[PDB]
Amino acid sequence: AAGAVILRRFAFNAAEQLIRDINDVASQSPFRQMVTPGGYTMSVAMTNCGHLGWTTHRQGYLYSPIDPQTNKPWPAMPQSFHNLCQRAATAAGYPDFQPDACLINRYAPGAKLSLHQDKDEPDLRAPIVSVSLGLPAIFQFGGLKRNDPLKRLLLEHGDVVVWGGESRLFYHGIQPLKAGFHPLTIDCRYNLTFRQAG
């Protein structure tokens, strides 16, 4: 993964607090399985915190400062989130990265996320910070086409990946979450993706 920086277990120490704050965020903006523009309910449940929140719209996908479900602003990005992200980005070589959106994904057993690209951001030179929590998942990324040599990478609890450079444009997805158990998330996997959407 050219440009990518994988920091395994980087968020192990912050894990517990992050999970507490995810629940906090969920209290204001509950996890919901968004309906794609094509009219299909995603198996992955999501929510957002920060100034902007990624969401499905009628004309496609886009960032909005308002939660379309609660009609209220997305919850603010918790300090735990801000700190872990900055430390990660800085360690990855991006000390200037200032995210304004954190997409929180929740994966129940069997949940998956078919291949896609993240080109909804204004400046693609800005990286994306991914933090995995709970059960392990198989992350798969390819080239520039939906049908390209896909590679696999297991993301475990506390794993952080700063996607910068070329990888920032690579197709990617998550294979069906295998059943299992984790003391902090029980049978769920959470993932935080910090972005500069503004």
Kindly tell me which of 12 and 61 has the beta carbon lying closer to Fe ion.
Answer: 61
For residues 112 and 171, give the distance between their C-alpha atoms in angstroms, rounded to a whole number.
15
- Minimal distance, residue 128 CB to Fe ion, in Å: 8
Q: Which does 103 bind (CB under 5 to 8 A by kind): ligand AKG, Fe ion, none?
A: ligand AKG
Nearest partner of 154 among 172, 131, 138, judged by Cα:
138
For residues 25 and 46, give the distance between their C-alpha atoms in angstroms, rounded to a whole number.
11
- Minimal distance, residue 183 CB to Fe ion, in Å: 27
Q: Annotated binding residue at 94?
A: no
Instruction: For residue 182, count other CB atoms closer than 10 A to its CB.
Output: 16
Residues 6+ apart with CB under 8 A from 159: 6, 7, 8, 9, 10, 11, 131, 132
For residues 112 and 44, give the distance between their C-alpha atoms in angstroms, rounded to a whole number.
6
Segment 118 to 147, residues that bind ligand AKG, using CB under 6 A: 118, 130, 139
Q: Annotated binding residue at 61?
A: yes
> Binding of Fe ion at residue 118 (CB under 5 A)?
yes
Q: Annotated binding residue at 62?
A: yes
Which spans of this chain sit near ligand AKG (rule: CB under 6 A)? Answer: 103, 105, 113, 118, 130, 139, 155, 172, 174, 191, 193
Could you list the residues known to form a binding site, using ranges: 54, 61-63, 105-107, 116, 118, 120, 146, 172, 189-195
